[PDB]
Structures are given as C-alpha cells and as structure tokens.
Amino acid sequence: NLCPFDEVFNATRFASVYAWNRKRISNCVADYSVLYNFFSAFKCYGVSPTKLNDLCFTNVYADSFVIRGNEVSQIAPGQTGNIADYNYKLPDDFTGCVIAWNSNKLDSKVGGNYNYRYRLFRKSNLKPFERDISTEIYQAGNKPCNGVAGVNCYFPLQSYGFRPTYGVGHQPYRVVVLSFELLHAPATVCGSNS
Amino acid sequence: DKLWILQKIYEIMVRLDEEGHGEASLMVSDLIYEFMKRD
C-alpha cells in the first residue's frame, strides 16, 4: 500500500508543459523523507519534507512536465514568464514542493526532439493550476486567420526541439510539482512518521 | 505598427529552426514573449 511515487518520477514518458500531466495520489502511505533522493533539485515552500512524514492529507497531486533549464525558476510562487503565464502557473500561496532534474540524455535527440512544446501566445495569463491544450491560431493583428497560420496568424505552440549539444540552460529538465490538499474528508495520504 | 516587426522576428525564429539553429531559435522565442508582453 505504498504510494506510487516511482511511477511519477521514474516514468518513461513525460508530458509537454502546455499539456502538463496531473496524477492524483491517494489511499496510500509514502516516505517523504526519502524524497531528497527521489540527481535532483528540490525546494518545498511549506513545511520540510521531514514534517511531511508527520502530516496526513486528503489528496496529493503530482504535476509533471518538461521545460528548459532556464525556465525551472518559473515553477515557483509569484513568478512571471512564458511558462508561468501561458503554460503552468503556481499560486502565490503555494506551500508544496518543486522537484526538477536535467534530462538531456533522455529527452534530447540528434536532429531535435520535437515532441515537447510550449505555448508562446495567449490572450490572458493562466490562473493557478489552469491547463490550456487548445491549438487555435493566435490572431495577432486585425485580419482573420480562417484557421490557417500565416502573417500575424501564429500557431500558438512552439517546440523546444531539444538537441544534446544545447547549453545547459537550454537542455530539457523534467519537473515534478507536489501539492498537498487537506479537505474536510478522511486524510488518506500519510507519511512515514504519522 | 508592431505587426511588421513582430512578423519579421517570428520569421527569424522559424528560419533558425529550419536551418538547424534550434538553440538560437529558442532565444528569439524569448524575445517574442517579452515583446508582446509590452503595451
């Protein structure tokens, strides 16, 4: 009855950031103290991962996606940028954990890996935890686009095209965001020292 | 108008990707974001 954190972090495929994946984790016990080694880079904005083993929650959500290394700093409360605004947005009062690690050897390809995309145009910023997977042509001018890309009519998603020779700031990073939900319901996700 | 220079910048981004300059295409992408974020 252990929590399936292994299927989250060590998964073969990761989603694009514009279509970020959400895995609801419930009805299990997890050892959050071992998450300092679950290569990595992690920061919890609430209590420490040690205190997480003492607490229980109704549901734990794991969000995962791939972005550039220089964009990981946007996966934090109070951030703005292309990713925060148009792709994945954390609330200002976020108290979960953000975990990211370089995935160059898995997600880069000679000639370019064009699977991973991000949204470059949007008419308004995302609300926290909003997801937008639409592919409507963005009309940048006053002339209609009639559903086809052209002058001032841009396909809203852009590919990263990851290549192994990119600088580290441009290499792909797999990111996992853990949010801890306490509802007025049985807290079915507990830690080790609970 | 902002529309002409935006189109030209966008075309440089596309051309860079077609010619294999993917990393430089990403940097031009960041310029597009910052430009449209303005007034």
Residue numbers in the entry:
A (entry chain B): 334 to 371, 374 to 529
B (entry chain A): 1 to 39
Show me the paper's own sentences about this structure:
The spike protein of the SARS-CoV-2 binds to human angiotensin-converting enzyme 2 (ACE2) through the receptor-binding domain (RBD) and changes the conformation to fuse the viral and cell membranes, mediating viral entry. Here, we used a structure-guided strategy to engineer an inhibitor peptide with mutation-tolerant and potent binding ability against all SARS-CoV-2 variants. We named the peptide CeSPIACE (COVID-19 eliminative Short-Peptide Inhibiting ACE2 binding). For engineering, we determined approximately 2 Å-resolution crystal structures of CeSPIACE or its intermediate-stage peptides complexed with the RBDs of several strains, including WT, Alpha, Delta, BA.2, BA.5, or XBB.1.5.
First, the main-chain structure of the ACE2-binding site is invariant to form the backbone of the binding site, though amino acid substitutions alter the side chain. Superimposition of the crystal structures confirmed that the RBD main chain of the binding interface was perfectly aligned, and the main-chain structures on RBD surfaces were invariant among various mutants. L3, Q7, E23, L26, and Y33 of CeSPIACE recognize the main-chain structure of RBD around A475-G476, N487, Y501-G502, Y495, and G416-N417, respectively, fitting into the groove between side chains. CeSPIACE was designed to interact with Y473, A475, N487, and Y489 via L3, L6, Q7, Y10, and M36; with R498 via G20; and with Y501 and G502 via G22, E23, and L26. M13 and V14 form a neutral and optimally sized pocket to accommodate both Q493 and cationic R493, which exist among Omicron subvariants. The longer side chain of R493 contacts the binding surface comprising M13 and V14 more extensively than Q493, resulting in retention of the binding state. Mutation mapping on the structure showed that most mutations of the Omicron subvariants were outside the CeSPIACE-binding site, but R403K, F456L, N460K, F486S/V/I/P, and R493Q were on the binding site. FSEC analyses showed that CeSPIACE can also potently bind to these binding-site mutations. The F486 mutations tended to reduce the ACE2 affinity but did not affect the CeSPIACE affinity because CeSPIACE recognizes the RBD main chain through L3 and Q7 whereas ACE2 primarily interacts with the F486 side chain. One of our intermediate peptides, Ce149, potently inhibited mutant RBDs up to the BA.2 strain by enhancing a hydrophobic interaction with F486, but its efficacy was attenuated by the F486V mutation of the BA.5 strain due to the high specificity for the F486 side chain, making it vulnerable to mutation.
